[PDB]
């Protein structure tokens, strides 16, 4: 265990964030919506993070008519609770026993469906990462595991490459053995951090190949290719401009559809947002407008925000 220290192997990121830059930062699929949306976010404290958010939406079905969320976060705890109409409750609780070990629990209640609980444990070593998440644990009369178990390991062979595997075991009812799936993950980061590449091979032959590039501090791009006999393929290109006044995002798919999403900050509190997707081949177009307004709960932060 001496040449390992001499090589100075760096700790790789989480297995779930191999293509995080492309999936979240670049592409606007996650942040796209339809109809009219208004958000009111009020913050009560800074060093202990604590805030609430009221969401009022109309003109669309994906966004609920009204929603209320409240989150708190101290140095080593995170607790978020959200309530949506028709009595849908979601709660996330993350605790870090140490800088390496993190335990998280997600509990959702639908008031008419069985309560769903997911427990995840993550460990970040000096040069490898191990995560294990369990969904709906159960034991039968034979003492056998029942539920969903996902165990992923990732190790960086060199400070530029990272290889890992993910194993899924899914037993639903317990009468029959669950299915097992193995996925291979590979990640490469350039020396200059200019561009990164990611690849994933699933158990069913599905392929994911993503590339992320950062031209400057205000311009990023990404390209994704997904594949799955009966197989289907998709190619997506996305571009993001991050400016001090506004944020622009555009995306185009190989099927001939395009989408745009802009966030314009005109006031220190109010910030408008527009989004639009057009598919000329299939004749399907969706639109969405929204606004975000921020307030300070206590007088100290109110004065700080006012100036």
């Amino acid at each position: 265990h001496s040449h390992r220290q001499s090589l100075e192997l760096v700790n790789p990121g989480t297995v779930e964030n191999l293509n995080k830059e492309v999936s979240r930062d670049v592409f606007l699929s996650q942040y796209f919506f339809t109809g009219l949306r208004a958000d009111l976010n009020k913050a009560f404290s800074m060093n202990p993070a604590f805030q609430t958010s009221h969401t009022f939406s109309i003109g669309s079905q994906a966004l609920p008519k009204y929603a209320f969320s409240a989150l708190f976060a101290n140095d080593n705890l995170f607790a978020q609770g959200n309530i949506d109409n028709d009595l849908s409750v979601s709660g996330r609780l993350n605790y870090g026993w140490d800088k390496k070990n993190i335990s998280k629990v997600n509990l959702q209640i639908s008031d008419g469906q069985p309560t769903m609980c997911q427990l995840e444990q993550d460990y970040q070593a000096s040069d490898f990462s191990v995560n294990v998440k369990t969904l709906n644990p159960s034991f039968s009369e034979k003492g056998e595991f029942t539920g969903v178990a996902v165990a992923s390991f990732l190790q960086s062979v060199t400070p530029q490459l990272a290889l890992g595997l993910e194993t899924l075991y899914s037993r639903t009812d317990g009468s029959a053995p669950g299915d097992a799936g193995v996925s291979y993950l590979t990640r490469y980061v350039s020396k200059k951090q200019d561009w990164i590449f990611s690849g994933q091979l699933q158990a069913n032959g599905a392929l994911i190949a993503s590339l992320w590039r950062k031209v400057a501090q205000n311009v990023e791009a990404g390209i994704e290719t997904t594949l799955q006999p009966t197989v289907e393929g998709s190619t997506t290109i996305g571009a993001k401009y991050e400016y001090r006044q506004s944020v622009y995002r555009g995306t185009l798919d190989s099927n001939g559809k395009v989408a745009c999403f802009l966030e314009r900050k005109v006031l220190p509190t109010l910030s408008v947002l527009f989004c639009g997707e057009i598919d000329h081949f299939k004749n399907d177009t969706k639109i969405g407008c929204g606004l975000q307004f921020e307030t300070a709960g206590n007088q100290e932060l109110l004065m700080l925000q006012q100036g």
Binding site: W195, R213, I223, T230, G233, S234, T235
Partner: protein, 35 residues
């Protein structure tokens, strides 16, 4: 003329490599405005 799943996989891979080449080319760098 193939019209096969392997053919469409190869076509998607060709699209991906063409996009990667475009990104690596100075055209993508010039696509970014100065500001």
């Amino acid at each position: 003329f193939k019209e096969s799943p392997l053919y469409t996989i190869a076509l998607n891979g060709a699209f991906f490599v063409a996009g990667v080449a475009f990104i690596q080319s100075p055209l993508m760098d010039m696509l970014a405005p100065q500001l």
